[PDB]
């Protein structure tokens, strides 16, 4: 009597399956990290991860070259396109189109038919004209997004075993996978750097970036509420210079860290010094490297005298690449860059908090350089977290809606660059443009 057979209990469960709660709650809890992950893209805080993502993509502005005959360099042609909400519907199929009675579509059907198990993806498009002169809402259907089984978007999410058997399913079907063309696929979980925490790494690639690079460096993987990531690296140059690495359009970019410091918040050099060394006034090692950093920045850019000028230099120097154009001034492009690159885990208006953390990363980097602390291990489980398949889903969706809006803007650019036949105000134009880009993101 230690592992006794559950014989009558089992055979009873085989003959008369549970009608209220599956047994073996570990069996459902084992795939909980998948299903739960997919539920967080449709329900949760604010509206779920996906609605935060579309709230973070913001706007895509385009100016029809508002002729008007400031009206010749201020155009007077603003078109702000965005996405307010994103809705996902449970699988349905209506035949002959509309004029039919709709039926719920079950996984058994997708498997028997050897087809995907799609849910209609809808997203509330916002067509804002002249910054507010005219607002247009449109719910656009973006094709069938494959829904995860037993998730908050599959009909089997809440079915009792008895109902599950009544729907031709494995009385215990865990789910968490996708029926795509009838083939069951799951998204493999991945081990990625632990978010939001500076990891001190010595890497010979860091020396491989070029001259004056040391091995030492800091890597923080900032992840936004919507779970999209942005890796930020600090490098200690052999010269004492510290450079800040980031990646945009999967291209890498280096900026002096003292620039992102003077750019985040208005401060004195003595405020950065106190931020870094503090009470530690006795580190000749750190006092001198920091004198090289601050004095060196004062050397390169003697005319960046205040934070605003610095912001203008960053927006002005990246305006060609952040695709924000005349639609923004170099101050706006600069601040939008800061908010979009530097420690995005701290969020908008976290620029003092981003300042404090960035100084903490510089200090950690000098503690690594001196050798007063050990380096961390990227491959230790200590320093790692798990990218859940559903989260990859939300990130790739966010990117697809960003591209979809980029495609609208491209379509307006082509139409206006070959005809300029019609104004941003026409509802006809909304239907026409929307009908000329491809919106089947489900496919």
């Amino acid at each position: 009597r230690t592992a006794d057979f559950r014989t009558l209990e089992r055979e009873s469960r085989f003959i008369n399956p549970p009608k209220d709660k599956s047994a073996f709650p570990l069996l459902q809890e084992a795939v909980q990290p998948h299903i739960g992950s997919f539920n967080a893209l449709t329900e949760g805080p604010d509206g779920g991860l996906l609605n935060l993502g579309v709230k973070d993509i913001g706007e895509k502005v385009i100016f029809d070259g508002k002729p008007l005959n400031s009206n010749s360099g201020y155009l007077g042609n603003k078109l702000s396109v965005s996405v307010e909400q994103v809705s996902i519907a449970k699988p349905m199929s209506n035949d002959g189109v509309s004029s039919a009675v709709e039926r719920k579509v079950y996984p058994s059907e997708s498997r028997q038919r050897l087809t995907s198990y799609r849910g209609k993806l809808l997203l509330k498009l916002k067509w804002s004209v002249n910054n507010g002169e005219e607002n247009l809402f449109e719910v656009r259907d973006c094709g069938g997004l494959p829904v995860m089984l037993q998730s908050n978007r599959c009909h089997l999410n809440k079915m009792s075993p008895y109902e599950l058997v009544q729907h031709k399913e494995e009385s215990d079907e865990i789910g968490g996978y996708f029926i795509v063309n009838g083939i069951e696929k799951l998204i493999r979980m991945l081990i990625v750097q632990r978010r939001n925490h500076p990891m001190a790494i010595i890497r010979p690639s860091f020396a491989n970036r070029g001259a004056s690079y040391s091995h030492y460096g800091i890597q923080i993987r900032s992840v936004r509420p919507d779970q999209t990531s942005q890796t930020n690296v600090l490098h200690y140059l052999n010269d004492g210079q510290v450079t800040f690495r980031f990646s945009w359009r999967k291209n890498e970019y280096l900026v002096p860290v003292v620039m992102i410091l003077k750019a985040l918040c208005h401060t004195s050099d003595r405020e950065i010094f106190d931020g870094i060394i503090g009470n530690d006034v006795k580190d000749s090692f750190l006092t001198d490297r920091l004198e090289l950093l601050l004095r060196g920045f004062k050397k390169r850019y003697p005319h960046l005298q205040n934070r605003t000028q610095v912001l203008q230099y960053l927006g002005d120097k990246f305006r060609v690449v952040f695709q924000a154009s005349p639609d923004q001034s170099d101050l706006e492009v600069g601040q939008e860059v800061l908010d979009r690159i530097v420690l995005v885990h701290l969020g908008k208006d976290g620029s003092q908090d981003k300042f404090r953390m960035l100084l903490f990363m510089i200090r950690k980097l000098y503690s690594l350089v001196a050798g007063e602390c050990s380096p961390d291990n990227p491959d230790a489980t200590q320093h790692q977290e798990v990218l859940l398949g559903g989260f990859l889903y939300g990130m790739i969706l966010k990117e697809k809606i960003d591209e979809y809006l980029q495609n609208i803007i491209a379509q307006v650019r082509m139409d206006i660059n070959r005809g300029m036949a019609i104004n941003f105000k026409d509802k006809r134009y909304m239907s026409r443009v929307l009908m000329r880009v491809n919106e089947n993101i489900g496919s």
């Binding site: 057979f5 014989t7 009558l8 089992r10 055979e11 085989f14 399956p17 058997v165 009385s171």
Partner: protein, 69 residues
């Protein structure tokens, strides 16, 4: 799938002894050992045949596509 007809190792027909064995575990509140002793499965090849069985057919049969549900 379904209670085997015979014990693989020995050869004694066992397929007749399933339902009574299950009755003996329910109705008589017996224990699996004594139930198998009263069934005459006095060898472990036989003992294990019925003792370990998993009559999965009851789970299969609820999937019968030839009747409305």
């Amino acid at each position: 799938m379904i209670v085997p007809v015979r014990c693989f190792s020995c050869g004694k027909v066992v397929g007749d002894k399933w339902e009574s064995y299950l009755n003996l575990l329910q109705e008589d509140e017996l224990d699996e050992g004594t139930a198998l002793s009263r069934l005459g499965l006095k060898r472990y090849c036989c003992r294990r045949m019925i003792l370990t069985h998993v009559d999965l057919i009851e789970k299969f049969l609820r999937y019968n596509p030839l009747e409305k549900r």
